Amino acid sequence: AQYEDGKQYTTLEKPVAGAPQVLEFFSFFCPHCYQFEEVLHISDNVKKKLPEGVKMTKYHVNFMGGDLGKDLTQAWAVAMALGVEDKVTVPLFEGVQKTQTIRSASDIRDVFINAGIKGEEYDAAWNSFVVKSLVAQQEKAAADVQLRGVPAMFVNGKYQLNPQGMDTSNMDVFVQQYADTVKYLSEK
């Protein structure tokens, strides 16, 4: 077939019921995640190929970067709670990987302040149980799929994208193949 289990995607041996339709995992410490966001814009190109108002979810992971990696999962929970993902994603990537100016939870906070989130509002969210619950959702979802690597994408809790078997000589063709595969998987 043109799409083959084991090739463009793997199929979850233990499928995860009641999982989000399109679920991506990333870390601000992961270089390929950096590219998926700023160079390839995977998420928006997947979104443009899927039906209206499909639910796309994106979660940070703890298993890279030690203490600060776990701080970033809580900060991503803040970003989700406030709906400011689009304003902090690039400066967080650049602060961790480009300028290496993010060394502490305070440095993470400066990124939200600079992006226009009020200091009071960031701190209330950071300390909120709504955010603690978002942190728990992120960890649980990663545990449900025994995640050990990013970037990762899962469709309908049953199929995992496998980009390692895709031609990467042309960025635009790669993105299109990634997005068309997700669409194919969502339609199964």
Ligand X SMILES: O=C(O)c1sc(Cc2ccccc2)nc1-c1ccccc1
96-101: list long-range contacts, CB under 8 Å, 24+ apart.
96/28, 96/29, 96/65, 96/68, 96/72, 97/28, 97/29, 97/31, 97/34
Binding residue (CB under 6 A) for ligand X from 21, 32, 38, 184: 32
Q: Residue 47, interface with ligand X (CB under 6 A)?
A: no
Q: Residue 61, interface with ligand X (CB under 6 A)?
A: no
Total site size for ligand X, rule CB under 6 A: 9
Q: Residue 172, interface with ligand X (CB under 6 A)?
A: no
Q: Residue 168, interface with ligand X (CB under 6 A)?
A: yes
Q: Which is nearer to ligand X, 115 or 166 (CB)?
A: 166
Stretch that binds ligand X, among 16-24, 107-115, 139-147, 163-171 (CB under 6 A): 163-171
The answer to whether 151 and 181 are in contact (CB under 8 A) is no
Binding residue (CB under 6 A) for ligand X from 174, 177, 180, 186: 174
Q: Residue 35, interface with ligand X (CB under 6 A)?
A: yes
> Apex CA 73: angle with CA 18 and CA 111, to 5°?
135
User: How far is Cα 23 from Cα 29, in angstroms, rounded to an integer?
Assistant: 19
Q: Residue 177, interface with ligand X (CB under 6 A)?
A: no
Nearest to 32 by CA among 155, 126, 171: 171
